[PDB]
Design a protein around this ligand. Structure first.
Ligand SMILES: NC(=O)C1=CN([C@@H]2O[C@H](COP(=O)(O)OP(=O)(O)OC[C@H]3O[C@@H](n4cnc5c(N)ncnc54)[C@H](O)[C@@H]3O)[C@@H](O)[C@H]2O)C=CC1
Ligand SMILES: NC(=O)C1=CN([C@@H]2O[C@H](COP(=O)(O)OP(=O)(O)OC[C@H]3O[C@@H](n4cnc5c(N)ncnc54)[C@H](O)[C@@H]3O)[C@@H](O)[C@H]2O)C=CC1
Ligand SMILES: [Mn+2]
Ligand SMILES: [Mn+2]
Ligand SMILES: [Zn+2]
Ligand SMILES: [Zn+2]
Lengths: 337, 337
């Protein structure tokens, strides 16, 4: 009982399950014995080396505090916790205005520092959020994805009367549909994608209109119904999208970007300022764990709709493969411990 | 006594002082006998045919009500008023959310409909705002330009500790500087411009640091001082500025765009979302006349610092030309009646 297994990305396309000493938490830290972890695009991108090595990945994880560091209440041992991967300094400009997600010395667990694809992880005490007993383990592991939705909608401020367009019906887009419908009671949620199976999944998650734009552009589809969205959320993120969103938008609308493309987006300010559009962006989460846990308590969102597969962590390579290849029928994939 | 002179743009590059019947206000309207009007860029653009007629121009004007239409209190006759050029429908989506400035059927006086470069003009009664006796005629006529500043800062929400960069020390940029300093008590207002004489005017209006970036890019000067603005306002509006603003921005910063360039701006989303920037735009004003009128009562802004020249309205062609030439010694030009 002195060592543990961790999934390590040594370099692009080298993933090993290595054995490590069980870590001790320092002051202000806790150790989590991990139960579940989720697979996200960022895990794939690090594995396939699209961007520091070696790195244990995984920023979506849930488990039980088995030990606490100095200055942490030992009563916390035994708590069921989901971990916010955003590690912030708490004193820089972004931190001072409640934006730890863009902290000047931001570290994301499973990205810039070792994360949750590991039998034990040491994390800041304040980042480990207690999950109510009524909230199932599998829903808890999904908190981090839903905090992305919470952060995005927090910028957009959806109203019940908004006409909302969401580009993309992957995992991310779907959590957003769920928050729009179940938390904000938006009456008209429109979702766009090119894959019919994902559009069906969007409907199942509460979309009012699932529109395929692989052949007919949204402009034609919308012109026909007289639709001009008042809130547009880009959960697809190809850089050409922003320019179309601007055209589609109602005057006075707002747009939320989620994409990190290093490729240029071309826009014409005449089209933006002429409609006095607002363009927000969203990165990670600004302390959204409490509110999402609240939503889970109230049954406002439905993670079971999005979880499609579960692999033991030893099969992580298989899990990631499936996640990469299977656009239909695969949504969110979990690793067990 | 039944006729009056108006300034008509018949077509591109053709300005004529014509004779017209003194108009009669209809229901909900008043006739204003104009005392002062201001010249703006949009007046020049309409004169020069920059939008690929005929129109009486002038959206910045002040005068006295001398007739009222049906439904308007007859007591308004004799009122000193400045006119909000924003004419909105009141029932479309933007109007319903308090954004008449982008009303789906917006008409701007002096742009889409006949304006204030005229001895008399008829306008909606609700658009004519009573000016306190203590506020001078030439201050009152400056209300519309200051409402632009009010609208912009409304989006930006400047705080005292914000590090603000304003691009452009033309008349628009200068109103922004005054509002930042005098209304929001921003401690650090930085202004960039290519012309030294205007940078000097920026200082006179309250700017804390006036930087010429005609030769040295702002990136260099900012790097040297360790400056990363938290609020960036583009009152210069060349389409390339946005991309530069994004690189200069602090993380979590916001940017307010004011430009209507039909040429493309290139931005890279990596740089926007990476810092979770918000990009606002501002057009005209959303009911900011009372706000600015209040600022004037309280002495928070100083319009006299911006007024450089006055011409009788018959010399408008000379006036506009001087406004178009001479960036050095000309700021805001008024027409008298
Ligand atoms: N905090 C943040 O900003 C985060 C951003 N992301 C980003 O969100 C995006 C979505 O993530 P996932 O759902 O996991 O990806 P995904 O690739 O599974 O889903 C994207 C979906 O968008 C669709 N799509 C692509 N172009 C489209 C267009 N022009 N119109 C309509 N649909 C279109 C695709 O068919 C695909 O179904 C990714 O680009 C990712 O980088 C992901 C996590 C956090
Ligand atoms: N509601 C709105 O959105 C309104 C927008 N505008 C726009 O605001 C802009 C400013 O109007 P004015 O003050 O009358 O224009 P102006 O031409 O008098 O002033 C613009 C200033 O920007 C400077 N400039 C240009 N490129 C620059 C760069 N890369 N860096 C730093 N400085 C730069 C110029 O030297 C000039 O002094 C115009 O483009 C106009 O179209 C004007 C009125 C209302
Ligand atoms: Mn995630
Ligand atoms: Mn103006
Ligand atoms: Zn910080
Ligand atoms: Zn309207």
């Amino acid at each position: 009982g002195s060592h543990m297994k961790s999934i390590l990305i040594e370099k692009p396309n080298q993933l090993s399950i290595i054995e490590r000493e069980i870590p001790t938490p320092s002051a202000g830290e806790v150790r989590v014995k991990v139960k579940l972890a989720g697979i996200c695009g960022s895990d794939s991108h690090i594995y396939r080396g699209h961007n520091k090595y070696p790195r244990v990945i995984g920023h979506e994880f849930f488990g039980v505090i088995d030990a606490v560091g100095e200055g942490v209440e030992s009563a916390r041992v035994g708590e069921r916790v989901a971990v916010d991967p955003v590690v912030s300094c708490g004193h820089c400009y972004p931190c001072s205005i409640g934006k730890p997600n863009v902290c000047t010395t931001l570290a994301v667990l499973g990205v810039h520092a070792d994360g949750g694809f590991s039998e034990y992880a040491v994390v800041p005490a304040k980042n480990a959020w207690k999950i109510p007993e009524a909230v199932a383990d599998q829903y808890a592991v999904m908190i981090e994805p839903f905090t992305i939705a919470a952060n995005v909608t927090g910028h957009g401020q959806p109203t019940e009367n908004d006409t909302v367009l969401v580009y993309g019906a992957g995992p991310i887009g779907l959590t957003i549909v769920q928050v729009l419908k179940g938390v904000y009671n938006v009456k008209n949620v429109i979702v766009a994608d090119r894959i019919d199976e994902r559009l069906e999944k969007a409907k199942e998650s509460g979309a009012d209109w699932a529109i395929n734009n692989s052949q007919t552009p949204l402009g034609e589809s919308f012109a026909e119904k007289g639709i001009k969205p008042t809130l547009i959320i880009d959960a697809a993120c190809h850089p050409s999208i922003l320019k179309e969103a601007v055209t589609l938008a109602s005057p006075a609308a707002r747009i939320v970007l989620m994409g990190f493309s290093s490729e240029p987006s071309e826009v014409i300010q005449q089209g933006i300022t002429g409609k006095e559009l607002s363009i927000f962006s969203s990165r990670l989460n600004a302390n959204k764990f409490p509110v999402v846990i609240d939503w889970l308590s109230k049954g406002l969102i439905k993670p079971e709709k999005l979880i499609t597969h579960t692999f033991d962590f030893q099969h992580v390579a298989d899990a990631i493969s499936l996640f990469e290849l299977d656009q239909k029928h695969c949504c969110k994939v979990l690793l067990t411990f």
